[PDB]
Amino acid sequence: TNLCPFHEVFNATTFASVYAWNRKRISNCVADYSVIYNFAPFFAFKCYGVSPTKLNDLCFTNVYADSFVIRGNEVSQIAPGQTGNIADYNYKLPDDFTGCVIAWNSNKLDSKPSGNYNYLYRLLRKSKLKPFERDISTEIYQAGNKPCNGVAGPNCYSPLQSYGFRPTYGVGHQPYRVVVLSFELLHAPATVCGPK
């Protein structure tokens, strides 16, 4: 039994966009949750199926660690039952989620004075995403009256729009990295227990 890649996920030099969020499956390692608080000045640490201090006691089989960046005023949207542009078109948690949502400010790392348009979010979609569904399609949205034929002509808009983080001023619009830890029952021989 070795250590978990928790320290290699929260301190990534490049974070995934909300429409291309990674899912690092964690198995066969001892979960040392003491390293989480060292690099996560959490703005919201609401756990919905576990306790933050009892993580070193319970044990799970497989742990999934999502990673995505969203707007500052959209941190509350990453929660079971929430709505919004992110909670409905980019990342939606189920009503029976069992884990914790970790989010911290990253204005000193994920922001540039010339505009960091490398992070994009989806604006519109014909239907909401299923729980834990990844949306990779970049096809031009159609207005319905006429097809766009792959070009963004009249009444044809691109589905991906950048955030454009501005480090000058403004609260609620700063870049915030979000990591979501998912725990499944999975009644099978466990592999990732606490450091006991």
């Epitope: 890649p5 974070f15 966009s17 690092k24 990844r134």
Partner: antibody, heavy 119, light 109 residues
Framework: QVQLVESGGGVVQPGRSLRLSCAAS????????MHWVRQAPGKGLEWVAV????????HYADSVKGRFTISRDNSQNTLYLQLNSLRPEDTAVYYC????????????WGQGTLGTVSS | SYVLTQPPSVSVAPGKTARIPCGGN??????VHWYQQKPGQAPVLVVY???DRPSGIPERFSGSNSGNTATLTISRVEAGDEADYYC???????????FGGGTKLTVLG
């Protein structure tokens, strides 16, 4: 058992179209997301396209954007791939793969089809 | 896009342990999947989430994910394991499934 058979291509002139197909059996074809991976003779694996479980989400590579179109037919469990506007650098062995989970691993493969762009 | 680095060719003696790495920038934050492609056939999955193997793969295959480079530990490599191996990772780019440059594992017969 899990079976994937890709229909053979053939010799085609540049600018033409090649019609491929991938018959799958042994697993639930309407649940897993099907992909396409091509391999040129003497070259490594390169991703081509991804089709959603229902055909809504579609994505392609930058080197094959615009001309290639991916499609699936769940009524008969046959994966299709229209190779429109062929180019000399498109000569590759197209493999019919299947995505396992959200982490992005392939568990099911076929045998590959031969598509040669000759002049 | 992401750039997976593989060695051009790795030679291993029969019965020994062969190790094919796969480097990358911050590769630890993502899963590395391996495939075994024998000349004349299609690739076959061996280790997907850096630790587990599907049904039909012997226990001699193993992997790890730590630091800035992956590791595919294959022990007791017989003469019948001469094939090419490839990596696969999911990146924060425009999402092309980045495959490695390929590594031909040859057994000194």
């Amino acid at each position: 058992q899990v079976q994937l058979v890709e229909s053979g291509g053939g010799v085609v002139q540049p600018g033409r179209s090649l019609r491929l197909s991938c018959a799958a059996s042994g697993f639930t074809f309407s649940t897993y997301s099907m992909h396409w991976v091509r391999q040129a003779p003497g070259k490594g694996l390169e991703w081509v396209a991804v089709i959603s479980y229902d055909g809504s989400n579609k994505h392609y590579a930058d080197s094959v954007k615009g001309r290639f179109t991916i499609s699936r037919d769940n009524s008969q469990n046959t994966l299709y791939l229209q190779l429109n506007s062929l180019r000399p650098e498109d000569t590759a062995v197209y493999y019919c793969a299947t995505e396992g989970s959200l982490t992005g691993y392939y568990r099911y493969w076929g045998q590959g089809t031969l598509g040669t762009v000759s002049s | 896009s992401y750039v997976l680095t593989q060695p051009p060719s790795v030679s291993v003696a029969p019965g020994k342990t062969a190790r094919i790495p796969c480097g990358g920038n911050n590769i630890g934050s993502k899963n590395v999947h391996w495939y075994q492609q024998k000349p004349g056939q299609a690739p076959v999955l061996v280790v997907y989430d850096d630790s587990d193997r599907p049904s039909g793969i012997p226990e001699r295959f193993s992997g790890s994910n730590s630091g800035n480079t992956a590791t595919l530990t294959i022990s007791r490599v017989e003469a019948g394991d001469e094939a090419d191996y490839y990596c696969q990772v999911w990146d924060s780019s425009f999402d092309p499934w980045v495959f490695g440059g390929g590594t031909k594992l040859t057994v000194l017969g």
